[PDB]
Design a protein around this ligand. Structure first.
Ligand SMILES: [K+]
Ligand SMILES: [K+]
Ligand SMILES: [K+]
Ligand SMILES: [K+]
Ligand SMILES: [K+]
Ligand SMILES: [K+]
Ligand SMILES: [K+]
Ligand SMILES: [Mg+2]
Ligand SMILES: [Mg+2]
Ligand SMILES: [Mg+2]
Ligand SMILES: [Mg+2]
Ligand SMILES: [Mg+2]
Ligand SMILES: [Mg+2]
Ligand SMILES: [Mg+2]
Ligand SMILES: [Mg+2]
Ligand SMILES: [Mg+2]
Ligand SMILES: [Mg+2]
Ligand SMILES: [Mg+2]
Ligand SMILES: [Mg+2]
Ligand SMILES: [Mg+2]
Ligand SMILES: [Mg+2]
Ligand SMILES: [Mg+2]
Ligand SMILES: [Mg+2]
Ligand SMILES: [Mg+2]
Ligand SMILES: [Mg+2]
Ligand SMILES: [Mg+2]
Ligand SMILES: [Mg+2]
Ligand SMILES: [Mg+2]
Ligand SMILES: [Mg+2]
Ligand SMILES: [Mg+2]
Ligand SMILES: [Mg+2]
Ligand SMILES: [Mg+2]
Ligand SMILES: [Mg+2]
Ligand SMILES: [Mg+2]
Ligand SMILES: [Mg+2]
Ligand SMILES: [Mg+2]
Ligand SMILES: [Mg+2]
Ligand SMILES: [Mg+2]
Ligand SMILES: [Mg+2]
Ligand SMILES: [Mg+2]
Ligand SMILES: [Mg+2]
Ligand SMILES: [Mg+2]
Ligand SMILES: [Mg+2]
Ligand SMILES: [Mg+2]
Ligand SMILES: [Mg+2]
Ligand SMILES: [Mg+2]
Ligand SMILES: [Mg+2]
Ligand SMILES: [Mg+2]
Ligand SMILES: [Mg+2]
Ligand SMILES: [Mg+2]
Ligand SMILES: [Mg+2]
Ligand SMILES: [Mg+2]
Ligand SMILES: [Mg+2]
Ligand code: NA
Ligand code: NA
Ligand code: NA
Ligand code: NA
Ligand SMILES: [Zn+2]
Lengths: 97, 57, 48, 127
RNA sequence: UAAGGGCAGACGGUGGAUGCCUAGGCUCUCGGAGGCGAAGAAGGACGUGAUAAGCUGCGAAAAGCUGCGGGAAUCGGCACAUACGAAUUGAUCCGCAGAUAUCCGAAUGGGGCAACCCGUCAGGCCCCUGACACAUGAAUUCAUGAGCGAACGCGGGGAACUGAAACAUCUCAUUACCCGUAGGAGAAGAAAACAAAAGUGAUUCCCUCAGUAGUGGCGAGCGAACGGGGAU
RNA sequence: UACCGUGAGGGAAAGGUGAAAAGAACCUCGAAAGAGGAGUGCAAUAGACCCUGAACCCGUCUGCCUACAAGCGGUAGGAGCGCCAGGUGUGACUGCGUGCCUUUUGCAUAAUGAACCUACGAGUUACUGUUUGUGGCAAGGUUAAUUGUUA
RNA sequence: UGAGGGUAGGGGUGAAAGGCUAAUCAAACUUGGAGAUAGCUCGUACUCCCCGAAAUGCAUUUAGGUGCAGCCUGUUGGAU
RNA sequence: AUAGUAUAUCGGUAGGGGAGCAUUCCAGCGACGUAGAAGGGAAAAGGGCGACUUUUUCUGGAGUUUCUGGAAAAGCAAAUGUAGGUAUAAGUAACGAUAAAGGGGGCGAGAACCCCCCUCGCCGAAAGACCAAGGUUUCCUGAUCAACGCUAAUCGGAUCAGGGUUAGUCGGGGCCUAAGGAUAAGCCGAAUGGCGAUUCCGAUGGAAGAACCGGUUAAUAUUCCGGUACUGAUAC
């Protein structure tokens, strides 16, 4: 189990991109990292194979990402309840996604 | 037959006083203007003593 | 000059091969010591 | 915590006024290379190129191509083609690089070690 | 003056010390368990991928096949890149039970230089190829065994260096080592026993008795039991 | 394991970029190896053999001294010169001075020993006594195996 | 002279040299007893302070070893 | 050291005694650190005396430490001591048979050495050709010149990739037995085991089953193709 997954909308809580939200693009389970859309861009130097510097999202360690509250816009911790199990936001109590 | 002692840095460096690379004997070519060795044919132009010697294609 | 090692594949297996080791109690004692050490090469029958 | 950033900023600002080129890990002995560096030290670059081109030492061909690079670095950092009679070799040094060890057999079963040495060469130019 | 040299400083080269760190070791405590194998083991050979050296997993059903329980969005090992796919009709992953499981190896149809060669017998295909069976020994066709593997147990054999400031009795030592063979432990065990007119009653192990009584080229050394206190 | 041995058998060395590969597009000199830039990054003198980065050993530069001078290379004096207010580098000239270890009656000894640096490297523990410093109890002192409670 | 066999360590083999038995032989090699024993040689690492010898006698399968005495030192009690 | 400041005393090997410093870790009371810890370079200052300590500055980029007590893997200059690194002799010995080279073209950044051509020289009962043992891809071709090649190298028995070995008769094996080996029935023997047939295994030998010449590939050839033969089974 992980507290985030693909398609989730999450807010960064630590790092240089703290205070920024975004959608989760890919989850690297073994390394415990995920790509969030529009955050943590990098300038990769690619040879033609036309070449040039290109932009891409670098993964953020998942412990710095929290699922945004359904009702309010702030990041909250989550839990699972039988109501199979399902995620829900600890700040408001509503089911998540 | 065998060195009784290792040589100090000073003794080794004193011997190497006479280890010098020899400078070439250079001259300018009156035709090309390039450096060439005195008493040889200029490899750039092919000339020697004011006359063409190696007509280079 | 002639040196000590003059190879013959027929002689090698007859003297040191797997089937000659297994034919006596002392040969099987050698095989047990090499297995307990974890040797990759058990006899000359392996290198072939 | 920004300390090493501030130390490095000053290091880069000084490098803008230094014109030099480097040769790293040249697979020849440093002592023989040094014989060539003593010949062109403190000498006008146009005369040194001809001296290196007609030298009888084999290490000179490598050094000749490094001097050409040093001059080109000077023009890049000064934004003009160099004149004739203007630049000169203000500094040059040869340092011993890492050694490759090898084996050479000797009589009666003994073996000796052979060292295949390397060197670094750095050249500075100045007006 | 300096071909050269000396000393000091500045900046570098080489080399990989030191500091910090850990992915691996070392010594133990508590609980469990103490085997695997002819229904073919331990250990190997050869194979197995879209791609594939080597490891890992697997066995011609070959990084794997089928159910049941779990779990919920990623997955096709280490391990990338490229390529094609799987999966909310629940993939991958975890627990349990099944299917498949080439050749060698106790190796057991006969041979053999391990991973190979050659058969008899019954079936089915077509010079060949499938799929069965076929060792020996101890019991009554049937049942059993063999081989491998930590230490601990019990048996059969059994050194020397060394100490005795030499050395032969003696010591090292009923040790090292070799061989046979059990079990989760084994061996011992229920008085033809100790004791001393006072008594205790199977065996085993701990603390004492005690470096004592003895033994001994009475040298170097070796060394109890009774009785008492415990575990059970 | 590699490697060594016919075989039984013997038997190594070798850890660390960065938070994240963001592992350096592109230009200049070069035939290209190598570098100078640019860019990424807190940092590239973190650039792949990459944390830190010592010694022996090796260079370049600057200051002072040195081509009439002779011994374990220092030590005690002492001008001049060069740097930064009396500190620091050097050292003309002078006095004195035969390394160190070990073994010996006695070693400059022509007795032993070492190329140099970094790292490694040699009176420890158990038990039984005895003397002693310090304590507890005292005509008495002390428990051993083991047992109970708790954790 | 080729191929394949056989003899194994106080054993083998030897037209005999103590020769040869895997570059090893008046007793091979490997592992173990095992860190054998060595009255012998070499080596033994921080600091300062106080005191400070002996190279003799006796005995010894003893003579370059050791036991006792003599000579040093700590603590303690006496004066000598 | 004695007396409580005075008197005396303070060279030392073997050796006896006293008092301390540093190192690693632990307990307790407490401190320091990204506004920069440890380590590394430089400088200055301290200590009855010393082992050592403190401060400043550069590097460095995450740990460190006072005091009191406790426990040790608790300190190197030398053992023909060990590992790793780097020196000296020294740009010295040497570059492995005195069969030998010269020129012109070529590819190429680069040629004494590579390719082609002309000349010269060496072997020729071999230094040529075919097998066995042993090796195991070194064979051919393209790319590459870091390492290897005692020089350089555009070359190589080097690195990487691709390719290449074709049998009714050849050589083996299938059959047979020798030395020797393993056994059966038996014999011997603390154990482990030692012996023991006309049996089996085991070629270096014996087979009543039989092929030779030529040509083609960059790399195979009694094997592929051509020609001309031979030998077993099997069905009509
Ligand atoms: K068989
Ligand atoms: K350095
Ligand atoms: K003078
Ligand atoms: K001598
Ligand atoms: K012997
Ligand atoms: K520490
Ligand atoms: K080629
Ligand atoms: Mg000279
Ligand atoms: Mg070289
Ligand atoms: Mg030349
Ligand atoms: Mg040789
Ligand atoms: Mg340095
Ligand atoms: Mg380290
Ligand atoms: Mg299911
Ligand atoms: Mg004795
Ligand atoms: Mg059993
Ligand atoms: Mg019991
Ligand atoms: Mg730095
Ligand atoms: Mg570094
Ligand atoms: Mg005079
Ligand atoms: Mg003497
Ligand atoms: Mg003496
Ligand atoms: Mg003297
Ligand atoms: Mg002398
Ligand atoms: Mg001596
Ligand atoms: Mg010496
Ligand atoms: Mg000496
Ligand atoms: Mg020394
Ligand atoms: Mg030393
Ligand atoms: Mg004789
Ligand atoms: Mg011999
Ligand atoms: Mg003997
Ligand atoms: Mg012993
Ligand atoms: Mg010993
Ligand atoms: Mg005195
Ligand atoms: Mg003696
Ligand atoms: Mg005495
Ligand atoms: Mg005095
Ligand atoms: Mg004194
Ligand atoms: Mg020597
Ligand atoms: Mg000489
Ligand atoms: Mg000479
Ligand atoms: Mg030679
Ligand atoms: Mg010569
Ligand atoms: Mg030659
Ligand atoms: Mg020939
Ligand atoms: Mg070839
Ligand atoms: Mg070369
Ligand atoms: Mg090739
Ligand atoms: Mg035939
Ligand atoms: Mg037969
Ligand atoms: Mg051919
Ligand atoms: Mg033919
Ligand atoms: Na000078
Ligand atoms: Na099958
Ligand atoms: Na700082
Ligand atoms: Na040290
Ligand atoms: Zn010219």
């Amino acid at each position: 189990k992980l507290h985030i997954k693909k398609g989730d909308t999450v807010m960064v809580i630590s790092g240089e991109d703290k205070g920024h939200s975004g959608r989760v693009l890919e989850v690297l389970v073994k390394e415990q990292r995920a790509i969030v859309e529009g955050l943590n861009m990098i300038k990769k130097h690619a040879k033609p194979s036309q070449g040039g510097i290109i932009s891409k999202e670098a993964p953020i360690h998942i412990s710095n990402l929290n699922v945004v509250d359904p009702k309010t816009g702030k990041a909250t911790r989550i839990g699972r309840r039988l109501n199979k199990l399902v995620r829900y936001a600890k700040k408001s109590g509503e089911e998540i996604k | 037959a065998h060195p009784k002692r290792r040589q100090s840095k000073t003794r080794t460096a004193k011997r190497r006083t006479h280890d010098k690379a020899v400078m070439p004997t250079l001259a300018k070519c009156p035709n090309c203007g390039a450096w060439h060795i005195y008493h040889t044919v200029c490899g750039d132009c092919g000339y020697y003593r004011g006359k063409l010697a190696i007509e280079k294609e | 000059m002639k040196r000590t090692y003059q190879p013959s594949n027929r002689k090698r297996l007859n003297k040191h091969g797997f089937r000659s080791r297994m034919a006596t109690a002392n040969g099987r004692r050698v095989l047990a010591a090499r297995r307990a050490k974890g040797r990759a090469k058990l006899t000359v029958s392996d290198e072939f | 915590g920004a300390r090493k950033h501030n130390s490095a900023e000053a290091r880069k600002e000084a490098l803008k006024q230094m014109y030099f080129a480097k040769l790293r890990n040249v697979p020849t002995s440093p002592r023989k290379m040094r014989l060539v560096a003593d010949m062109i030290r403190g000498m006008e670059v146009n005369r040194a190129l001809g001296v290196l081109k007609f030298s009888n030492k084999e290490a000179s061909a490598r050094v000749e191509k490094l001097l050409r690079s040093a001059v080109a670095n000077w023009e890049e950092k000064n934004e003009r083609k160099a004149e004739e009679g203007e630049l000169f070799v203000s500094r040059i040094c040869v340092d011993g690089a890492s050694t490759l060890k090898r084996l050479r057999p000797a009589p009666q079963g003994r073996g000796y070690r052979i060292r295949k040495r390397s060197n670094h060469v750095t050249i500075y130019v100045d007006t």
